[PDB]
Structures are given as C-alpha cells and as structure tokens.
Design an enzyme around this catalytic site. Structure first.
Site, short mmCIF file in Angstrom:
data_model
loop_
_atom_site.label_atom_id
_atom_site.label_comp_id
_atom_site.label_asym_id
_atom_site.label_seq_id
_atom_site.Cartn_x
_atom_site.Cartn_y
_atom_site.Cartn_z
CD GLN A 1 -1.35 -0.04 3.62
OE1 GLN A 1 -1.67 0.93 4.30
NE2 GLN A 1 -2.00 -1.18 3.77
CB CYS B 1 -5.11 -1.13 5.30
SG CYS B 1 -6.34 -0.50 6.47
CG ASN C 1 -0.07 -6.55 6.75
OD1 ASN C 1 -0.89 -5.69 6.42
ND2 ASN C 1 0.77 -6.26 7.73
CG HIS D 1 -3.82 -2.87 9.18
ND1 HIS D 1 -3.50 -2.32 8.01
CD2 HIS D 1 -3.19 -4.09 9.24
CE1 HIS D 1 -2.73 -3.17 7.36
NE2 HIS D 1 -2.55 -4.21 8.11
C1 LIG Z 1 -5.22 0.61 7.36
C2 LIG Z 1 -5.25 2.06 6.93
O1 LIG Z 1 -4.56 2.23 5.91
C3 LIG Z 1 -6.04 3.21 7.55
C4 LIG Z 1 -5.49 4.61 7.48
N1 LIG Z 1 -7.28 2.98 8.26
C5 LIG Z 1 -8.38 2.52 7.65
O2 LIG Z 1 -8.42 2.21 6.45
C6 LIG Z 1 -9.31 1.93 8.68
C7 LIG Z 1 -9.36 0.39 8.55
C8 LIG Z 1 -10.49 -0.21 9.37
C9 LIG Z 1 -10.60 0.14 10.72
C10 LIG Z 1 -11.68 -0.31 11.48
C11 LIG Z 1 -12.64 -1.10 10.86
O3 LIG Z 1 -13.70 -1.56 11.60
C12 LIG Z 1 -12.53 -1.47 9.52
C13 LIG Z 1 -11.46 -1.01 8.76
N2 LIG Z 1 -10.65 2.47 8.50
C14 LIG Z 1 -11.07 3.64 8.96
O4 LIG Z 1 -10.31 4.60 8.94
O5 LIG Z 1 -12.45 3.79 8.66
C15 LIG Z 1 -12.98 5.05 8.30
C16 LIG Z 1 -14.10 5.66 7.50
C17 LIG Z 1 -13.83 6.34 6.30
C18 LIG Z 1 -14.91 6.72 5.49
C19 LIG Z 1 -16.22 6.42 5.87
C20 LIG Z 1 -16.47 5.76 7.08
C21 LIG Z 1 -15.41 5.37 7.90
#
Ligand SMILES: *CC(=O)[C@H](C)NC(=O)[C@H](Cc1ccc(O)cc1)NC(=O)OCc1ccccc1
Length: 215
Positions: free
Chosen positions: A19, A25, A182, A162
């Site tokens: 990534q 992620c 991962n 993540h």
């Molecule tokens: C892994 C990564 O790169 C980052 C910056 N974080 C995300 O992508 C989070 C991953 C995740 C976390 C908790 C979960 O239950 C599922 C996936 N996600 C997160 O940041 O969610 C945010 C969001 C964005 C837009 C709309 C709703 C929620």
C-alpha cells in the site's frame, strides 16, 4: 471442521502487494478477498485493482481510510458488480495521494453479487473459511511493526485500525493459529504473512469479518 486448511497451498491466493504511503489497507483487504472468491467460483486466479476503490469509491475516504463492507457494496451498487484487473488499473497511490477516478479504459476481471458478514466467533469463522475460502477481517495492528516471525501469542487488542485477509488456520499445531496476508510488502513478517494465536481473539480478529459472494 477440517484440522488445518491453507488456501495458499490450493492455488487460491495471489502474491503479497504494497500500500505504500496511502492509508488504503481497507481496499487491499476487500480486493484480496474478491480475488480468492473469484478463483473458488471456478475461474482463473486474476489480480484485481485496489486503485479502483481508492480513487473511485466515494463512500470511503481514499488515502484517509475506509471500510471493507462499504467497498463491497460500492462495487455492487455503484459499479454494476464489476472489479477491474490490476493490470488495466494499476496502483498509483504509493506516494500517499489518490489521483482522480478514471471511469473508462479498464477491463472487468471479476464480478460479485453481494457480501455476507460473518459471526463474531473464531470457531464459526473457521468453519466457513474451510468450505468457502478467505475472509476479509479488521484488526488492531498497533504491535505489528515489531512482528518478525513465529506465532504471535500475545497482541495489543483494543482498537481496530487495519484491514487484512485471513487465508487459513491450523488447529493441530502446538498453539492453533490463523494465517493472515498483509499489505506492507514481502519484506515484513513471514514473507508478507503473519500468524497469530487462534481462540483468544488476538488483535480483535473475530470482530469485523466479511466476504464477497461471487456471481
Ligand atoms: C489501514 C489504513 O490504511 C487506515 C489509514 N485505516 C483505515 O483504512 C481503517 C481500517 C479499518 C478500521 C476499522 C474497521 O472496523 C474497519 C477497517 N478504517 C477507517 O479509517 O475507517 C474510516 C471511514 C472512512 C470513510 C467512511 C467511514 C469510515
């Protein structure tokens, strides 16, 4: 349920990806699961595009984060079930920036009809995995920058941050474990993979598990 299943040893899993600087992620988790589910539906294993989600899935936030379940439903509801091949829409967010979405010039490599959300129970997750294949899962990855190899028997488990892909388990080992793909290149962990203890909700692995259903 079978004693051990590893979908990598069954031609079902594509190579480890990266990534980069983008907080993408969620997109890697969602697409890795679609790739495996397409193969298991009786089609050739094809690499599919995470960039399609990062740039075009406006129900998530690109390089700021997103959710696997929102990505699955954007595919069915906004992109007519289509997932493009990675070759026709390559990753372009490595520098931490998401370029504007391109709606043409790509090729459909898989289609899905919807998605299911699995029980918050590791034994139940394992029974479905064994028959139906790899599952997208969310974890607390706070301690994973110190993971060097082996079965991680203890993990900080307090906030999900993540998304990754569950590709197998082994319940006949000394400590039963989960096998997780991962997206931080092959240079991290065991050739890009991590094994965590199974049965004690390590890194909050049972909390948000789902899968695309092909069609
Ligand atoms: C892994 C990564 O790169 C980052 C910056 N974080 C995300 O992508 C989070 C991953 C995740 C976390 C908790 C979960 O239950 C599922 C996936 N996600 C997160 O940041 O969610 C945010 C969001 C964005 C837009 C709309 C709703 C929620």
């Amino acid at each position: 349920a079978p004693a051990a299943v590893d979908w990598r040893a069954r031609g079902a899993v594509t190579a480890v990806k990266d990534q980069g600087q983008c907080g993408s992620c969620w997109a890697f988790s969602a697409i890795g699961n679609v790739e495996c589910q397409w193969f298991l539906a009786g089609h050739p294993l094809t690499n599919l595009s995470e960039q399609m989600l990062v740039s075009c899935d406006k129900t998530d936030s690109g390089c700021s984060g997103g959710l696997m379940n929102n990505a699955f439903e954007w595919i069915v509801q906004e992109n007519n079930g289509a997932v493009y091949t990675e070759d026709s829409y390559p990753y372009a967010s490595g520098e931490g920036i998401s370029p504007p979405c391109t709606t043409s010039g790509h090729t459909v490599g898989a289609t899905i009809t919807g998605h299911v959300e699995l029980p918050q129970d590791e034994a139940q997750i394992a029974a479905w995995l064994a028959v139906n294949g790899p599952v997208a899962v969310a974890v607390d990855a706070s301690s994973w920058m110190t993971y060097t190899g082996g079965v991680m028997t203890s993990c900080v488990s307090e906030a999900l941050d993540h998304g990754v892909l569950l590709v197998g388990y082994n319940d006949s080992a000394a400590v039963p474990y989960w096998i997780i793909k991962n997206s931080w290149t092959t240079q991290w962990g065991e050739e890009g993979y991590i094994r965590i203890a199974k049965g004690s909700n390590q890194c909050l692995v049972k909390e948000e598990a789902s899968s695309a259903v092909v069609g």
